[PDB]
Amino acid sequence: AYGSVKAYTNFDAERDALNIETAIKTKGVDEVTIVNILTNRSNEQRQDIAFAYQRRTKKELASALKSALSGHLETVILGLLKTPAQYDASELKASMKGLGTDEDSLIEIICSRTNQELQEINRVYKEMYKTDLEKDIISDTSGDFRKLMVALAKGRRAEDGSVIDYELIDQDARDLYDAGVKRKGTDVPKWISIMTERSVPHLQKVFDRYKSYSPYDMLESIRKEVKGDLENAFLNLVQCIQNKPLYFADRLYDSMKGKGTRDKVLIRIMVSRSEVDMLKIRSEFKRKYGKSLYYYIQQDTKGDYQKALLYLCGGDD
Numbered sequence: 406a407y408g409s410v411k412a413y414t415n416f417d418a419e420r421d422a423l424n425i426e427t428a429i430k431t432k433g434v435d436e437v438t439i440v441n442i443l444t445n446r447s448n449e450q451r452q453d454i455a456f457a458y459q460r461r462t463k464k465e466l467a468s469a470l471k472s473a474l475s476g477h478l479e480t481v482i483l484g485l486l487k488t489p490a491q492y493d494a495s496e497l498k499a500s501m502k503g504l505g506t507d508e509d510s511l512i513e514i515i516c517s518r519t520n521q522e523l524q525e526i527n528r529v530y531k532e533m534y535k536t537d538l539e540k541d542i543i544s545d546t547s548g549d550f551r552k553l554m555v556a557l558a559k560g561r562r563a564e565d566g567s568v569i570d571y572e573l574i575d576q577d578a579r580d581l582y583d584a585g586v587k588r589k590g591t592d593v594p595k596w597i598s599i600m601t602e603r604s605v606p607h608l609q610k611v612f613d614r615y616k617s618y619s620p621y622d623m624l625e626s627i628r629k630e631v632k633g634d635l636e637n638a639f640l641n642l643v644q645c646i647q648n649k650p651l652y653f654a655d656r657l658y659d660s661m662k663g664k665g666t667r668d669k670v671l672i673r674i675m676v677s678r679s680e681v682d683m684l685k686i687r688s689e690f691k692r693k694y695g696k697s698l699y700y701y702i703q704q705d706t707k708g709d710y711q712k713a714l715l716y717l718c719g720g721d722d
């Protein structure tokens with residue numbers, strides 16, 4: 406409901422598949438037409454176009470476009486063609502490269518996805534790679550960090566209940582302070598337990614009730630009590646629970662603020678959150694960093710790649 410790319414009203418899968426077939430078979434490849442079409446269609450509509458294209462040409466659209474395109478634009482388009490679950494699962498599999506695992510992407514995806522999304526992701530992952538996500542998480546992670554990632558990826562977080570339990574909120578804040586800053590050392594399993602099991606609004610009110618018992622807020626308490634992968638995961642998780650659009654705005658900023666561009670993160674965010682809360686991310690981004698997201702994307706990317714990302718953004722703020 407808060408996505409930037411909406412379902413195209415006057416949609417016709419057959420003509421889109423025709424125009425795309427034409428744009429592909431065009432000499433020198435017509436990237437502009439492909440971008441113009443795919444970036445203004447909903448994911449489901451893109452699936453419809455894929456099916457129509459398949460019936461028309463008896464070749465799958467993703468293959469033809471992987472042949473017709475290259476580089477970052479290829480990455481973006483092939484990212485858009487997949488269903489949300491498929492894309493997330495594929496990114497997760499890509500992030501797990503043994504001991505040199507990209508833990509940043511892994512954290513980004515596992516910490517920010519909801520119960521339904523994770524439930525679908527586990528199934529699709531198992532169907533795609535004939536192996537449960539948990540086995541690979543265990544294989545490519547270790548320790549309390551592993552435990553946390555496994556807990557989160559199980560996707561059985563409690564749902565937001567009818568009634569607000571302020572008492573349990575208070576007791577959770579107390580438990581968090583007692584297991585963290587109060588004692589020397591850290592009771593990590595209790596932290597993981599509370600942060601993975603309780604619902605999101607409950608954990609918001611808990612995170613702000615924690616400010617009453619502790620001299621440091623939740624983020625700083627994390628920066629002090631634990632460090633490393635565990636720390637990064639806890640930080641990202643808390644950022645997501647508190648303010649997810651702001652979190653993704655910060656993640657977008659971090660991907661472009663420095664030298665070059667962390668295109669994996671940029672592309673993944675602009676694709677996965679295009680039909681979710683891209684409007685809110687734009688809002689938070691301009692509210693915090695002065696200029697629009699469109700602007701940063703414009704200054705840090707060029708060409709039809711830039712064009713695609715700008716279409717996924719949806720105008721200047």
Ligand SMILES: [Ca+2]
Pocket residue numbers: 471472474475476479
């Ligand atoms: Ca290629």
Ligand SMILES: [Ca+2]
Pocket residue numbers: 585586587588589590591630
């Ligand atoms: Ca301590």
Ligand SMILES: [Ca+2]
Pocket residue numbers: 661662663664665666705
């Ligand atoms: Ca840059």
